[PDB]
Symmetry: C2
Subunit: 90 residues, 2 copies
């Protein structure tokens, strides 16, 4: 049993994302096709104390390299962030 | 405050990994260099009930594409799994 519920899925339609520098970049479609595996919360936490403990489930993210571009041109690998898990916050 | 403690880091020395098919593949060094961002548990869970609730923190994984090869030759993109977060189990 988990404290938070999640759902994982294969994302084939991503075309924009925020990179490590906070910029909005275009995520290319091919590299072989470029798709991503993400897992986000579904939606207190299960098994929590609640008495002197408040909790909510939050979906965390992480960095993965993606072949992206900016104002088009400048195509290359950059670190973009995607949903990767669902964790509890007290 | 989180229920489980973790540590994230940049991995530059990965050279082997298990892919989605359960095989052991060689992870190449270059593609630009190929490195990974992972986050694993540090090390019950914080804020848990413990009374009629047992919990341990476990590090979860996820799939990311990596330029890998097998018995060498056959170089290409495959889905390999890496540590991505630390979640509580009841």
């Amino acid at each position: 049993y988990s404290v938070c519920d999640s759902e994982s899925l294969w994302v084939t339609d991503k075309s924009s994302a925020i990179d490590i520098r906070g910029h909005q970049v275009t995520v290319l479609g091919e590299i072989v096709k470029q798709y991503f595996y993400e897992t986000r919360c579904k939606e207190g936490c299960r098994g929590i104390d609640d008495k002197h403990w408040n909790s909510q489930c939050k979906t965390s993210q992480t960095y993965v390299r993606a072949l992206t571009s900016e104002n088009n041109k400048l195509v290359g690998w950059r670190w973009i962030r995607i949903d990767t898990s669902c964790v509890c916050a007290l």
